[PDB]
Coordinates of C-alpha atoms in Angstrom, one line a residue:
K1 CA 235.5 151.2 15.3
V2 CA 231.8 151.7 14.7
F3 CA 231.2 151.0 11.1
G4 CA 228.6 152.9 9.1
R5 CA 226.0 150.6 7.4
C6 CA 227.2 151.1 3.9
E7 CA 230.9 151.2 5.0
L8 CA 230.5 147.7 6.5
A9 CA 228.5 146.4 3.5
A10 CA 231.2 147.5 1.0
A11 CA 233.9 145.9 3.2
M12 CA 232.0 142.6 3.4
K13 CA 231.4 142.7 -0.3
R14 CA 235.2 143.2 -0.9
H15 CA 235.8 140.1 1.2
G16 CA 233.5 137.7 -0.8
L17 CA 230.5 137.6 1.6
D18 CA 228.0 138.6 -1.0
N19 CA 225.9 135.4 -1.6
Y20 CA 228.6 133.2 0.1
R21 CA 226.9 129.8 0.2
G22 CA 223.7 131.5 -1.0
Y23 CA 223.6 134.1 1.8
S24 CA 223.2 137.5 0.2
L25 CA 225.2 140.6 1.4
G26 CA 222.1 142.1 3.2
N27 CA 222.0 139.0 5.4
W28 CA 225.5 139.6 6.7
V29 CA 224.9 143.3 7.2
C30 CA 221.6 142.7 9.1
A31 CA 223.2 140.1 11.4
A32 CA 226.1 142.5 12.3
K33 CA 223.6 145.3 13.2
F34 CA 221.7 143.1 15.6
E35 CA 224.8 141.2 17.0
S36 CA 227.1 144.2 17.6
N37 CA 225.4 147.4 16.4
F38 CA 228.3 147.6 13.9
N39 CA 230.8 148.0 16.7
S40 CA 234.1 146.1 16.2
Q41 CA 235.1 146.5 19.8
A42 CA 231.8 145.1 21.3
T43 CA 232.6 142.1 23.6
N44 CA 230.2 139.9 25.5
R45 CA 231.6 137.9 28.3
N46 CA 229.9 134.6 28.9
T47 CA 229.4 132.6 32.1
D48 CA 231.8 129.8 31.0
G49 CA 234.5 132.5 30.8
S50 CA 234.5 132.9 27.0
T51 CA 233.9 136.2 25.3
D52 CA 232.3 137.1 22.0
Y53 CA 234.2 139.5 19.7
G54 CA 233.8 141.8 16.8
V55 CA 230.9 142.8 14.5
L56 CA 229.6 139.2 14.4
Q57 CA 230.3 138.3 18.1
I58 CA 232.4 135.3 17.5
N59 CA 233.2 133.2 20.5
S60 CA 236.6 132.5 22.1
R61 CA 235.9 128.9 23.3
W62 CA 235.8 127.6 19.8
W63 CA 236.8 130.0 17.1
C64 CA 239.5 132.4 18.2
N65 CA 242.2 132.4 20.9
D66 CA 242.0 135.3 23.4
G67 CA 244.6 133.8 25.8
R68 CA 242.0 134.1 28.6
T69 CA 239.5 131.3 27.8
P70 CA 239.7 127.9 29.5
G71 CA 240.0 125.3 26.8
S72 CA 240.0 127.4 23.6
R73 CA 240.1 125.3 20.4
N74 CA 240.7 128.2 18.0
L75 CA 239.2 126.7 14.8
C76 CA 239.7 130.0 12.8
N77 CA 243.3 130.0 13.9
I78 CA 243.4 133.7 14.8
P79 CA 243.8 135.8 18.0
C80 CA 240.4 137.2 19.0
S81 CA 242.0 140.7 18.7
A82 CA 242.0 140.3 14.9
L83 CA 238.2 140.4 15.1
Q84 CA 238.3 143.8 16.8
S85 CA 240.3 145.5 14.0
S86 CA 238.9 148.0 11.6
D87 CA 240.1 145.6 9.0
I88 CA 237.3 143.1 8.4
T89 CA 239.6 140.4 6.8
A90 CA 239.8 138.1 9.8
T91 CA 236.1 138.5 10.6
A92 CA 235.2 137.6 6.9
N93 CA 237.5 134.5 6.8
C94 CA 236.3 133.2 10.2
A95 CA 232.6 133.9 9.4
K96 CA 233.1 131.8 6.2
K97 CA 234.3 128.9 8.4
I98 CA 231.4 129.2 10.8
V99 CA 228.8 129.1 8.0
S100 CA 230.4 126.2 6.0
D101 CA 229.7 123.5 8.6
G102 CA 226.7 124.0 11.0
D103 CA 223.3 125.4 10.6
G104 CA 224.5 128.1 8.1
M105 CA 223.5 131.5 9.3
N106 CA 221.4 130.1 12.1
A107 CA 224.6 130.2 14.1
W108 CA 223.7 133.9 14.8
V109 CA 220.5 134.0 16.9
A110 CA 219.9 137.7 16.3
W111 CA 220.0 136.9 12.5
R112 CA 217.2 134.3 13.0
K113 CA 215.2 136.8 15.0
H114 CA 215.6 139.9 12.9
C115 CA 216.7 139.1 9.4
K116 CA 215.8 135.6 8.3
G117 CA 212.6 135.5 6.2
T118 CA 212.4 139.3 5.7
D119 CA 213.7 141.4 2.7
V120 CA 217.3 142.2 3.6
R121 CA 218.1 144.1 0.3
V122 CA 216.9 147.2 2.3
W123 CA 220.0 146.8 4.5
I124 CA 222.3 147.8 1.6
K125 CA 219.9 150.3 0.0
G126 CA 221.5 153.6 -0.7
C127 CA 225.0 152.0 -0.6
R128 CA 225.3 151.9 -4.4
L129 CA 226.4 148.3 -4.3

């Protein structure tokens, strides 16, 4: 499904991402734009045989099981297909796990390049949130 900007913002807000660990809603929305262009079915196959899934391009070697990745650890305890859903629930829960224990949002390199350090309230402007 290709989410609209405000559609995705409201869904993320419903799932507790707004200011989760101090990272405001506009940060999560900006990162999804530049990671997947808001496309839940975007997938990026990597040289090591893992693929990145969903609006935040989460990787199958560590975070989700796709049944096709040599040595998946599945830390979010989900099938990767759950990240392709129009239901954001599994994306929101797994993204919460990713941010709790590394470099925060620096985990998404497109976020560092396009979002970090700039006003991200503009990403939810006009959404009436």
